[PDB]
Design a protein around this ligand. Structure first.
Ligand SMILES: CCCCn1c(=O)n(Cc2ccccc2F)c(=O)c2[nH]c(Cc3ccc(NC(C)=O)cc3)nc21
Ligand SMILES: [Mn+2]
Ligand code: NA
Length: 605
């Protein structure tokens, strides 16, 4: 009866709990066929070919095995306003704010979710194939790795999941009869189609809903096929669900790149960094450093799972298998390693296409050859006078991590890499120096808590996790604070960076990019106890002449590193207001103390 629908694999080979998850949802969604993914190259080639037929993907003939998907303009991004966590008690998910609506999460009652679920999923896959994606977050078989099963009616999701996760039969074999996170996804357009189909990309914007049910170990997503909404291992699983598990089991699931940096003497450290959007996070993750003798290597560009080892060192793994990177602004100058990575075996979404089957986007910094023309992401002839970008601002490459020329040798080690420094950062046109260092662990947690960044609007994004907290942010802060009482903890040094400070004409004070190796150099030596410190009210900055400026043009170091009482009076008042308002009864006393200490330090300047 159900075996009759199966077009690849066998129900009898699946572990019982996987079979039952499949059976329950096939009955609910009523797909025409079941395809159990094996993750093989042969399967991938076949789905691409099928997606090419149906106009889902176009071949990019300039490259080896590269493909382009164009979406419905209504479905172009991860959508927070349609994203919820479902728990019995609201407080477990989000703090009750003093005023307004919480910006720290979006809670939906179990009752409300059942209704919303029943209004969407029954019969949602009629006319489509349900794909069964067995995937591992983290190196196959590792202590810190977790496995999920994603059922989807989207072949784009399957092919993207193959890159972004370890996917297929080896995962089922590692899983056996173990636990897994249940992931259910549908584009929400059963056949026959009730509504027009734009660029062969099905979506249901009106009913779009991305839900998390932590107690059930379930992620349920409806109506969007795009990145953060559909690739369920990434944000939904590896950040939201995982951060909750992390708090319960004593580890951390964080929105952090991980890189390894080696000095000219062969000494190597691993660093983690959390940035909000529009900060060049991926660029830093695979930075080509300007300083002679230095090496930078990439562990991951988005997510880090961290746990104390037996000697109290924080060990990170990258739970992803690829990079889901923003395309526009990617060039040989801004990210030479990302450019090499994406030359082959890569899926691009919503970028432009050149007439010779290449890709294009704003800031690609690549002059077109004579007679080459550009088709935009809206399938229109494009010119620079059109007054709209050739690529969507949120357009993507989706690319294997193994292909990064500077992929770290330990990027898949099951034991993880030891983190010696955590870097918080933002885009701040005024007031905030290029780099500073936390005064203590408690102060460091507060620095993460206080993060704000220019999106012409400056908004708060604490730990870069604001859209991603799996649970009460107040409890998340308490969890971070508790790391200082972990026996023999070797706590990472905490820093804050701003690449984006401007002079009064809005010119950037710091050249940045590969020159940010100089800032990493200072952090590196600080971790090693170098007396390169000068104390300020906000933390330590580099002493006079301590930052390595050899080979640079003139830098206005005085403005770059200036700390104004006026600016910081306003800053701390804004930080206090936001944290007391938003975190309310759940704000740890250690953070209250750091807010007041900063105020006192500022008042004395
Ligand atoms: C979302 C787009 C972010 C782009 N981006 C950016 O991505 N990084 C981060 C970064 C890039 C490459 C390597 C490492 C790294 F950390 C910067 O340091 C940076 N500075 C700046 C501002 C800047 C600074 C200087 C200049 N030009 C000149 C001549 O100085 C142009 C722009 N943009 C950066
Ligand atoms: Mn991210
Ligand atoms: Na987005």
């Amino acid at each position: 009866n159900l075996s009759a629908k199966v077009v690849q694999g066998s129900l009898d080979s699946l572990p019982q709990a996987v079979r039952e998850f499949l059976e329950n949802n096939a009955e609910l969604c009523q797909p025409d066929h079941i395809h159990i993914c094996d993750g093989s190259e042969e399967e991938n080639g076949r789905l691409l070919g099928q997606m090419e037929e149906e106009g889902i993907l176009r071949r990019l003939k300039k490259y080896d095995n590269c493909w382009l998907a164009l979406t419905d303009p209504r479905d172009v991004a991860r959508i927070e306003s349609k994203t919820v966590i479902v728990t019995q008690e609201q407080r477990d998910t989000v703090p009750i704010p003093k005023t307004g609506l919480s910006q720290l999460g979006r809670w939906m009652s179990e009752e409300d979710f059942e209704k919303a679920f029943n209004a969407r999923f029954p019969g949602c896959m009629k006319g489509r194939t349900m794909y069964v994606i067995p995937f591992s977050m983290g190196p196959l078989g590792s202590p810190l790795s977790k496995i999920g099963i994603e059922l989807t009616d989207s072949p784009y999701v399957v092919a993207s999941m193959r890159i972004m996760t370890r996917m297929g039969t080896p995962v089922l074999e590692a899983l056996g009869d173990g636990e897994f996170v249940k992931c259910l996804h549908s584009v929400g357009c059963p056949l026959p189609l009730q509504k027009p189909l734009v660029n062969n990309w099905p979506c249901n914007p009106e009913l779009t809903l991305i839900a998390h049910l932590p107690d059930r170990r379930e992620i349920i997503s409806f109506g969007s096929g795009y990145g953060g909404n559909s690739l369920l291992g990434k944000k939904c699983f590896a950040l939201r669900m995982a951060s909750r598990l992390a708090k319960e089991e004593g580890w951390l699931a964080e929105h952090m790149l991980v890189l390894g940096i080696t000095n000219p003497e062969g000494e190597k450290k691993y660093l983690a960094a959390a940035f909000p959007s529009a900060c060049g996070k991926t660029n830093l993750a695979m930075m080509n450093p300007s300083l002679p003798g230095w090496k930078v290597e990439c562990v991951g560009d988005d997510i880090a799972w961290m746990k104390f080892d037996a000697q109290g060192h924080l060990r990170a793994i990258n739970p992803e298998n690829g990079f889901f990177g923003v395309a526009p602004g990617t060039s040989v100058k801004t990210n030479p390693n990302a450019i090499k990575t994406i030359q082959k075996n890569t899926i691009f979404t919503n970028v432009a296409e050149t007439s010779d089957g290449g890709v294009y986007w704003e800031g690609i910094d690549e002059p077109l050859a004579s007679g080459v023309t550009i088709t935009s992401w809206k399938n229109k002839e494009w010119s620079s006078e059109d007054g709209e970008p050739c690529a969507h601002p949120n357009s993507r490459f989706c690319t294997p991590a193994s292909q990064c020329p500077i992929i770290d040798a330990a990027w898949e080690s099951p034991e993880g890499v030891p983190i010696e420094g955590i870097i918080f950062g933002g885009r701040r046109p005024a007031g905030v120096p290029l780099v500073y260092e936390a005064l203590s662990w408690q102060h460091g947690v507060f620095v993460g808590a206080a993060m704000r960044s220019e999106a012409k609007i400056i908004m708060h994004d604490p730990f870069a996790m604001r859209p991603f907290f799996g649970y009460n942010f107040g409890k998340y802060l308490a969890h971070w604070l508790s790391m200082a009482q972990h026996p023999a903890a070797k706590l990472p040094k905490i820093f804050h960076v701003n690449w984006f400070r401007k002079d009064k004409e809005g010119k950037f004070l710091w050249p940045g990019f590969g020159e940010n190796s100089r800032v990493l150099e200072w952090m590196f030596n600080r971790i090693d106890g170098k007396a390169s410190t000068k104390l300020t009210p906000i933390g330590y900055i580099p002493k006079e002449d301590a930052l390595n400026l050899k080979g640079l043009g003139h830098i206005n170091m005085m403005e770059l590193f200036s700390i104004s009482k006026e600016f910081w009076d306003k800053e701390v008042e804004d930080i206090e207001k936001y944290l007391v308002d938003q975190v309310n009864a759940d704000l740890p006393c250690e953070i209250e103390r750091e807010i007041l200490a900063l105020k006192q330090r500022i008042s004395q300047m």
